[PDB]
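Record type: ASSEMBLY
Status: queued
Input:
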Amino acid sequence: TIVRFNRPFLMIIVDNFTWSIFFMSKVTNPKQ
Amino acid sequence: GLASANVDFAFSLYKQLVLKAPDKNVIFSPVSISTALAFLSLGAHNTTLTEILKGLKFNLTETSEAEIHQSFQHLLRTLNQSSDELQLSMGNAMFVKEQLSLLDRFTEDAKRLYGSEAFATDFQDSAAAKKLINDYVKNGTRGKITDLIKDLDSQTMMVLVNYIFFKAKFEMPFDPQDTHQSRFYLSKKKYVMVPMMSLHHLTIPYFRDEELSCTVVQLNGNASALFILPDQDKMEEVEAMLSQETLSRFFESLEFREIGELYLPKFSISRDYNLNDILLQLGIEEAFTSKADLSGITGARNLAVSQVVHKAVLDVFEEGTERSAATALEVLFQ
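Status: finished
Output:
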């Protein structure tokens, strides 16, 4: 199995207990 | 009940940020923004107050005002931690025109619940006031956010500020010897070369969602870092399914799996925003007009919000990640 982040992707940082979202990102172009 | 509010708020805001420019990178901290607005609500009354709390997606029939503030106080304490694996910090502050009289209940509540002090500030010396605030944010974010405040009205009465900083090591770091320039497909037909980190024979939580045409993994304390990788041209479809229900199914469906190869770019990105339009769309309206009731701050309805700004930065590298964000709420006299 290969997981290749070579296309747009999302990242979400979630508080386990409260589900507060501490940070969220969509990377459409890492060279910005 | 608080969990449903937090996710609804984060995803509502996310979609609103995307709508303004659907192909741009997005980076933001939902909790930085909600903490700043909840802090403001400590001084709000009547419709100004109810609009703020409803805009943060709380339902005031399940959760009382006191329970909301208690949740932010607890959250603030969970986001100040240090270990060999992690550095987390979160702070709040108020910068206030020196001669402005504040109610003792407000400054007591602000320190106890939000950890906020009050800094006497001469906003009429705009350059000096901006430096004072930007330096506070620079200090809290370890130099990662340094220009949160660009323009600042010389007639400002107060600025409420939140910052958050998060630095973490990967459980399994990438070897920089295995980072190589590789294609990143902005679309099927548009691609650039980026430094692409790689790891082999990894065992990590994994879920292939054939229904949503995406793969979810977790790399890495007590926070879960979810990576969601839509198939090519499926990002818009995945965004359309984001919700508490979908996030729950992701977490429920993860299972450990040996992955042959993992490729993740090395990169740093930044975004900044003015959130007035979005907050008005979420129904937080009276706070921006002359009907604003922030009389819990001063004892008179003599303040209203002028500007809400947010900036956030994300850095991903072989050893781990660094994330930072800050929010400022600028307040004028009325």
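Annotation: Chain A has one domain: 1-32.
Annotation: DSSP finds no helices and three strands in chain A.
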